[PDB]
């Protein structure tokens, strides 16, 4: 069964601002998701310094981006620390975030949307280009779970019996809007990566599908 949770009020406001923003430079969403992926990789690697066994569920540390054109989906995967069920629930919606209201105020005063990561709330930049999102996550401390939001006032958390096992880490599965399908293109993804994520400690893999000729 799927469990349903209410978003904290300000987080619902933020999603609503972001999903209904005409604004330019939407490409910044990729920088933010790569940064989070990199943060999740830092954590597992730092944890592993004193607990090497933690790496064993997925010994390769990578960031991997997979266009799925038929579904109009873009997936960004990392083999970082992952999140437990309680973490998905608490950290992705139910609990007020320090920077939510401050960012919205900054935006309202003229701040660049790309400042979002500096307010600690950059995950929500995915709504720039997606109308729906699944966060699929496996922490060493829990089962694999699916968190899901359509920017509306509630999200669901479901035990994952439908997706590939990840050994450890997270997949952000972005259901792209019809006007943002450009982010399925290899050439476009490489440009955005090379522009705004030059200094990343982990390999960034692009999964490309090609008809044999
Ligand atoms: C143990 O740290 C967790 C996370 O706690 C559950 C840490 C915090 C949410 C916070 O630490 C200060 C943030 C750490 C970050 O690096 C980025 C953030 N910005 C966000 O917009 C949010 C809400 C990200 C949340 C989950 C995200 C999909 C994550 O992205 C992944 N896992 O790829 C994420 C950064 C999860 C990390 C690994 C944080 O809050």
Swiss-Prot record:
Question: Further remark, if any?
Answer: Present with 444943 molecules/cell in log phase SD medium.
Q: How does it assemble?
A: Homodimer. Interacts with the co-chaperones AHA1, CDC37, CNS1, CPR6, CPR7, HCH1, SBA1, SSE1 and STI1. CNS1, CPR6, CPR7 and STI1. Interacts directly with the substrates GCN2, HAP1 and STE11.
Q: What's the impact of mutating residue 80 to S?
A: Reduces client protein activation activity, leading to growth defect at high temperatures
Q: Which residues bind ATP?
A: 32, 36, 78, 83, 91, 97-99, 118-123, 170
Q: What does the domain comment read? A: The TPR repeat-binding motif mediates interaction with TPR repeat-containing proteins like the co-chaperones AHA1, CDC37, CNS1, CPR6, CPR7, HCH1, SBA1, SSE1 and STI1. CNS1, CPR6, CPR7 and STI1.
Protein name per UniProt: ATP-dependent molecular chaperone HSP82
What happens on changing residue 82 to D?
Abolishes ATPase activity
Report the family membership.
Belongs to the heat shock protein 90 family.
Which effect does the record note for changing residue 169 to D?
Answer: Induces a total loss of function at 34 degrees Celsius. Abolishes interaction with SBA1
- Tell where it localizes: Cytoplasm
Q: Tell me, using the record's free text, what induces this protein.
A: Expressed constitutively and induced by high temperatures dependent on transcription factor HSF1. According to PubMed:2674684, it is constitutively expressed at low levels, however, due to the specificity of the antibody, this result is unsure.
Q: What does this protein do?
A: Molecular chaperone that promotes the maturation, structural maintenance and proper regulation of specific target proteins involved in cell cycle control and signal transduction. Undergoes a functional cycle that is linked to its ATPase activity. The nucleotide-free form of the dimer is found in an open conformation in which the N-termini are not dimerized and the complex is ready for client protein binding.
